């Protein structure tokens, strides 16, 4: 009922007295919300009047594949998002099979949200802050399920030459526990991070069965606190994989990883450097970088790279309960239960 496979314990609008509602656009949602957060006479209440089961029937696939034909004209243009904000009774954010959408979900300073089978694309506004999805100051959040992406390139003249397309699952502030799985992220610069600054430190997030495919960083750039990677298949990252500084501490394993360069790294800072515990990845020794093709290249600035694949600290207890199947078995059959249309599908050592 409440378990993700991660930190997040959220059943989401999945409750006792929810309220289901079909949503076909963007502006349904927003009216959605809004009226779920008034009472019987009419009246507001604080963090919503009653738990919602939103059903996004929506399709945007024109919107999507003419922003795919010209890439660099997304970033200047308005960003689209639909805001969960202070909303706390329990919201669970459902695409049904054949939806898709060119706007993201920002969520911030709410709790329980759980949004799930959306597939995201190619959001204008990277210039914005036009986020797939964004976790601000928001515990017990579960993004799974979905397919996120855009293209894994950058345009010329872009504010800050990193502006072409903003982040898939950008997590910062109080978001206290966070669990992102079975999404497929693909065709993404910037994946998302833990922690917006050098101050915004902590969180626990589990980041699980996820398939990852030419992507080039932040997977995620950790600031501080802890984050499990487990079941995660990670090829063709052209940048960098998890990035975990700020003393941050980093489980990473049965994970299987593959033409990547700087898999596991603590870079970009020069000091206080973050910590892995790896155990059960398809790489377990230097040897294997060459049959996996893993490279890693150096920084200007003092770093760490994980490449003698050695475990550089050590990790607490894990809380939940989860069951990893092998690296193998997450690179022959995670793809077929990442993503949207899988039914919410869960990768078991029974299906191995
Ligand atoms: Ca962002």
């Given at each position: 009922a409440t378990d993700t496979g991660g930190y997040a314990a959220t059943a989401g609008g999945n409750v006792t007295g929810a309220v289901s509602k079909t949503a076909t656009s963007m502006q349904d949602i927003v009216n959605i919300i809004d009226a779920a957060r008034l009472d019987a006479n009419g009246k507001k209440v604080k963090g919503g009047a009653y738990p919602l089961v939103i059903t996004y029937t929506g399709n945007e696939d024109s919107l999507i594949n003419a922003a795919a034909a010209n890439?660099?004209?997304?970033?200047?243009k308005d960003p689209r998002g639909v805001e969960i904000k202070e909303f706390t009774k329990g919201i669970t954010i459902i695409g049904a099979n054949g939806s898709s959408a060119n706007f993201g979900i920002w969520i911030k300073k709410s709790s329980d949200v759980v949004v799930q089978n959306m597939r995201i694309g190619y959001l204008p506004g990277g210039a914005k802050d036009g986020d797939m999805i964004r976790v601000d100051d928001?515990?017990?959040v579960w993004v799974d399920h979905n397919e996120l992406f855009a293209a894994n390139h950058e345009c010329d003249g872009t504010p800050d030459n990193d502006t072409t397309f903003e982040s898939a699952v950008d997590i910062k502030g109080a978001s206290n526990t966070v669990t992102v799985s079975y999404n497929y992220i693909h065709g993404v610069k910037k994946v998302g991070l833990?922690?917006?600054?050098?101050?915004?430190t902590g969180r626990n997030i589990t980041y699980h069965h996820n398939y990852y495919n030419d992507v080039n960083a932040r997977?995620?750039?950790?600031?501080?606190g802890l984050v499990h990677a487990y079941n995660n298949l990670y090829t063709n990252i052209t940048g960098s994989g998890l990035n975990v500084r700020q003393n941050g501490q980093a489980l990473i394993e049965n994970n299987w990883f593959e033409k990547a360069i700087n898999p596991v790294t603590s870079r970009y800072?020069?000091?206080?450097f973050g910590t892995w515990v790896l155990k059960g990845?398809?790489?377990?020794?230097?040897?294997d970088f060459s049959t996996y093709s893993i490279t890693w290249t150096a920084d200007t600035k003092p770093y760490v790279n994980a490449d003698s694949w050695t475990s550089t600290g050590t990790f607490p207890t894990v809380a939940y309960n989860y069951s990893p199947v092998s690296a193998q078995c997450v690179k022959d059959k995670l793809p077929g239960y990442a993503g949207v249309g899988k039914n919410l599908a869960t990768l078991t050592s029974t299906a191995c």
């Open positions: 890439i660099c004209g997304q970033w200047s928001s515990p017990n833990d922690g917006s600054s050098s101050s915004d997977l995620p750039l950790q600031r501080g800072d020069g000091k206080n990845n398809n790489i377990t020794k230097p040897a």
